[PDB]
Subunit: 314 residues, 3 copies
């Protein structure tokens, strides 16, 4: 089977807007665990992590709330490593994308051979020195990459981090708002990506074929899908902090996640950047949450062609 | 030429909402016959069928309004067989999709070799025993399939039905809300389908190439297109009873119907499930009707690249 | 480098609605020149052309405002030829599409070997005798084509025109509302086109590969892109005079223009038919202008994957 361990991560200090803290609540209120159970799934809820307040947390140079973000990911890393030890797929409900530092680190403690698929409008690979916003949700990949060891200063809250993935172990899908220093890093390190230009050229079918052949061609290994809902067009996921037009369609989102399910190798999942307070109407909220739920159920086997139990229904 | 015989089928008892009865009226009011005439076409209006009320029509087990639905399709079968005998393409304006039992049966009385293309979010292949809703618009394909003879109980109103197509003679396009028993039937009988996952993988161009090669590869034969407007995304066809997100685009709808026109083998057409009373605004209504008209004109030769008469326009 | 010369062409008499005169103003107010400068670009503003009023300009047969439209294009031709002589890419901000008569003519005075890519819902190839509207924005290609010399009467205001491109030197992309005489001309002269049916069949990636191989396969030559914002779906560009559903997506627009940038051969650009007074809300206006700006920045190197200077950002 495909057993799941849910971790709520109601955390926002990777970016300015507090409302991403409500992500785990609204996803749960939408029926996510029940819907997973209705499907094939063995679901264990590990609850919502209690992130304690750090009142003294002044910027490190440009970088904001560093101790809060570092501690939150340190905590999340421990929890993810626990559910992996318990032989379940970690499903992290965010919260802002800085949490991927903890989610991927904890996962790699148990499965050092993982490969990452990063669905996002953004590369999230600024370093604490290339960042212009100082927002740690725009930096998580730089903390994770072994090649960028030497380029990450000693940021308070992160001394526990050990880079765990190499540039050859991640694929981006959905890119359309990449900062110049980020583009430099991508080209310098030879990281594999499918920007929206590539999705337009190739179609999502060939994008997935190529993604999965690149990560799993040599040998089967665990897959970590880090899904920023702003990877999808804001006509599907408007209640998010950094929307960018010309995104992946609803259909393309489901296709990506259906194909990853079918590898049988999904090992960790992040559903990040849902911020209900940013919808301009209550329907923009429902739209966003419903889409996030649909993407999540596809990761665990819900197929558009249909599903049945191995019984004779006639 | 390509002569057409219009049949209005203002019938709703295959499902709960009465407003699909207005389908033939609003399609006609939108200028459909005049627009067909403006095009290449020889159009004969056979009028709207008068469906008489059946006051005593209690459910058969789960199954609702069985005698009303059976009689309506029996009537429609006769009428379609008439216009086929008169050497015209039957164009059935619905009405709910239970009418396809009559439309395809009547057609097959004259052209037993037909092939069916079924454009829908749904497979409509529940049997009277697998159905959970008891709504006959979700069952028509099971009454038509020769393989499912033995699995259809003797439902009052349907003793006149003789299954007329085999599992190898239908192709589905657009599927995204298939019940478990339906998915079992699809896999058991080896029915050809292009769910939205397949349309995403392949593109609509390859979907059509493959559809038409599957049905017409061995030999040319008449094609019956049964078109449920909920096959298209509800952003194009919102005024319908069972909308499902992530549908075929307007463009994909026109492409399907342009390609079928170009085979020269269109023999019967169903335009089903238009329900103006379900639009939330008068523009949702116009949107839905206009899209249904556009799909219909493409079936009879309107091409996006343009059209001209065999005259010298210079 | 890729130096640009901006020409504002605030002209509307090719069609009935005056508000396309505001196109150059709103594009400039949206930050277009500054955004180009932020990118790689060497931008020289040649200002807005002053089109003088012609009070005595009665129709020529069907054809409206002929002397106004002819004079405006004569003026624009001179200006475009100037900026080409100055070794810059002419960027014409319209204004209605009748201006392409001047823009392409002026360009060809300096680069007689150019090839044209015409992005539009419409072919704009009516002659003064096949037109039914008499609106010159629907006629510019017929004045430009050497093969249609003999079929263009002597229209007042156009005696200065010399047809400068052959039928083999233009490719259309986006067609979906082509008049019968226009379709006759397309088929008679064997003009290359990708209607929306072809874009649906092939995908925009293969459309661009085929466009560019057709125009540049034999030898490199300058490219003139004439971009009517109604080529894009009205969900992206609603503030325009002749919207047509089922258009190119935002993504497809950016892909077309990214691919043309990458040839290194863009030589002239037209951004036509933006009419802010036709948006039904202030957001429809911003939507339309923002999309036109995005298409324009892609023509000059803005890439969705990102951009960086040849510096070490680490
Ligand atoms: N590159 C910008 C945007 C980051 C957006 C972060 B994300 O993808 O997690 O939403 C920044 O560094 O601040
Ligand atoms: N499978 C559901 C939905 C049927 C919808 C029917 B249709 O496709 O014609 O709109 C049911 O059996 O009730
Ligand atoms: N074919 C119609 C429509 C022309 C629309 C012009 B255009 O593409 O520049 O917006 C006419 O001749 O009037
Ligand atoms: Mn993002
Ligand atoms: Mn992100
Ligand atoms: Mn349906
Ligand atoms: Mn149906
Ligand atoms: Mn146009
Ligand atoms: Mn035009």
């Amino acid at each position: 089977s495909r057993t799941i361990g849910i971790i709520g991560a109601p955390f926002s200090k990777g970016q300015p807007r507090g409302g991403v803290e409500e992500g785990p609540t609204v996803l749960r209120k939408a029926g996510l665990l029940e819907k997973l159970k209705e499907q094939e799934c063995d679901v264990k809820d590990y609850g919502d992590l209690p992130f304690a307040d750090i009142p003294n947390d002044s910027p490190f140079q440009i970088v904001k709330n560093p101790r809060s973000v570092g501690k939150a990911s340190e905590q999340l890393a421990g929890k993810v490593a626990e559910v992996k030890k318990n032989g379940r797929i970690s499903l992290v409900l965010g919260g802002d994308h800085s949490l991927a530092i903890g989610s991927i680190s904890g996962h790699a403690r148990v499965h050092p051979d993982l490969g990452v698929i990063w669905v996002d409008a953004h590369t999230d690979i600024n370093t604490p020195l290339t960042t212009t916003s100082g927002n740690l949700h725009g930096q998580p990949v730089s903390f994770l990459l072994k090649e960028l060891k030497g380029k990450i200063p000693d940021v308070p809250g992160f001394s526990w981090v050990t880079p765990c993935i190499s540039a050859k172990d991640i694929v981006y899908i959905g890119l359309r708002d990449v900062d110049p220093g980020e583009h430099y890093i991508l080209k310098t390190l030879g990281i594999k990506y499918f920007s929206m230009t590539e999705v337009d050229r190739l179609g999502i079918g060939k994008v997935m074929e190529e993604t999965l052949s690149y990560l799993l061609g040599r040998k089967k290994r665990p897959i970590h899908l880090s899904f920023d809902v702003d990877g999808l067009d804001p006509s599907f996921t408007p209640a998010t902090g950094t929307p960018v037009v010309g995104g992946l369609t609803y259909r393309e989102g489901l296709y990506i996640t259906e194909e990853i399910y079918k590898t049988g190798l999904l090992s960790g999942l992040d559903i990040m950047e849902v911020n209900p307070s940013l919808g301009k109407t209550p329907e923009e909220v429902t739209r966003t949450v419903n889409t996030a739920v649909a993407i999540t159920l596809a990761c665990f086997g819900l197929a558009r062609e249909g599903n049945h139990k191995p019984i004779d229904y006639l």
